[PDB]
Write a protein that binds this ligand. Sequence first.
Ligand SMILES: CC(C)(COP(=O)(O)OP(=O)(O)OC[C@H]1O[C@@H](n2cnc3c(N)ncnc32)[C@H](O)[C@@H]1OP(=O)(O)O)[C@@H](O)C(=O)NCCC(=O)NCCS
Ligand SMILES: Nc1nc2c(c(=O)[nH]1)N[C@@H](CNc1ccc(C(=O)N[C@@H](CCC(=O)O)C(=O)O)cc1)CN2
Length: 563
Amino acid sequence: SHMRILFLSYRFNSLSQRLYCELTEREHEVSVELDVHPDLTVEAAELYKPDLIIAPFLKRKIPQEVWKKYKTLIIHPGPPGDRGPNALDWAIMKGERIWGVTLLEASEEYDAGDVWAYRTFPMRFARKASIYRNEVTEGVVECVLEALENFERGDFKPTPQKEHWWNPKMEQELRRVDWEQDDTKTVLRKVYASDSQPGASSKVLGKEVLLFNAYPEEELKGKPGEVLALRDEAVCIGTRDGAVWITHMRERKKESIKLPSARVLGEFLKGVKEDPIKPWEKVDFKTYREILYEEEDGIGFIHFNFYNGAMSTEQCYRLLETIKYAKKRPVKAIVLLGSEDFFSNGMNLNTIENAESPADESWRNINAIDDVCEEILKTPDKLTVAGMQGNAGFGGVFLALTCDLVFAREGVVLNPHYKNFGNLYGSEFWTYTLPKRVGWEKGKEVMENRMPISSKKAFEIGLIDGVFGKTPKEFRQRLKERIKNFINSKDFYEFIEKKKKERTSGEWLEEIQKCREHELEKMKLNFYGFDTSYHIARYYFVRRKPHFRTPPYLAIHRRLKFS
Ligand SMILES: CC(C)(COP(=O)(O)OP(=O)(O)OC[C@H]1O[C@@H](n2cnc3c(N)ncnc32)[C@H](O)[C@@H]1OP(=O)(O)O)[C@@H](O)C(=O)NCCC(=O)NCCS
Ligand SMILES: Nc1nc2c(c(=O)[nH]1)N[C@@H](CNc1ccc(C(=O)N[C@@H](CCC(=O)O)C(=O)O)cc1)CN2
């Protein structure tokens, strides 16, 4: 019953990773072939001889030689009968109330194969990536697990499609924001449909840009197209009936880097005044709040919505300032909540690559995230909690591990490792937090593993302290009630008493410092030494360069001892 399954994916993306966790933790073997060349895909399937092929994310046709020989099921992020490469883009642009996902059989015509499973769900008015990572992903997991059981059953007959419609690749002219003609709702719809790829084209201050990560603004009312304000490198732009914040942009050029808006517009933003809102301020209206601090029931909650989970050096210092604020408050616990889509993905590779010296900026960024980690660790008189509502990878996983307690939503995927990105040693005090949780033996195994793990697996191995809730909202409510009941028990004051004794002693203070300097010694060699694999890997990743090989940690079939 344990199947051998081959994934065909354009990239090993969030959906591919989630499915990888769901299948392998059910004791199926999953090998991945990235979509490099049809000839390579033919070879992959003849080497691996899968029981079943699943294509979670693919942008071109599987060759007939493969799907006529091996049963091949393709994910489509739309309901049955929807066909085309940009299903979610069109669903958002058209304002569809209900949407869905479909698992269909490979065929010669795009998205025309018989249906193995499907789920429908109501749409949210939200970024494409948010729909993809939540509703679409959860529905795909259900369809794939259902198709697996039906495949093992042996007698299954898929349903041919009846009604169908085709939506082609959406052109940039359809996404383009015209500030004079588009009200705020229209700007949001266009950016949402284009986020995180490929962006909504527009002209801001006479510059051709692509827009990402929009938020309505209800106070600042200016003139259509006028850059009204700057807040944490996001810009606020007047629309037909109001204003919208745009936090990130990209020059309308090949292989340009997605960056905070202020680093793209740059010289054209002289005279635009910063308009700050401290995270702890209460505000009556809709606006962009990168970081939000709220106190409830003796708990201080810190939301930090860093686009794509990437924490630039400057974002790290803004988070650090909010943590220091919270530590002076009369709360018994501080909870780091990240955002709904990500807890954290560690250093911001985009702002590093864009820096005059990416090596220097790497150094600044890793010291800044370590300063956040050290501030959390040196909190002897309050409980600290990491609540991972969404995925965490790289330095962001070990950020969470500096908190006393780590909890995650069901279905969150963790990448507690670096080795994919030119073998960084990592820091964030992992040489202290990881052995304390799972020991050194199991600790090195965790960081040697280059594949994702679910929050359920992380809990089973003792990497985190609990997993609960199906949605961000349900996770936050359960987390709050769990912490509330703990900080009002006797074991809280007993826990804090032991934490005070330990984290005020010089021996603990000394051990922590030695951990940081050892990790940063290794990291400095990653950044400045003869090996430049980190810099090369960074260049390809941030500029969306295509894959030319599937590495052996993904492709079981491309390993040496294979038969
Ligand atoms: C984007 C999409 C294509 C899926 O990819 P994904 O969910 O983003 O997968 P990932 O796990 O790699 O997400 C990581 C993101 O966080 C960014 N990120 C993470 N850590 C980062 C860091 N330290 N620094 C900078 N950026 C970071 C990544 O750059 C990436 O963002 P990007 O999409 O702008 O490149 C999805 O939105 C979509 O629309 N799919 C439809 C296509 C389809 O289904 N076709 C048919 C399939 S059979
Ligand atoms: N055997 C086969 N292979 C497939 C599918 C299939 O059902 N049958 N379904 C594919 C997923 N859905 C689509 C639908 C349309 C397009 C498409 O239209 N692509 C452009 C390429 C431009 C682009 O990058 O989008 C083209 O002209 O070929 C790509 C994937 C995955 N590969």
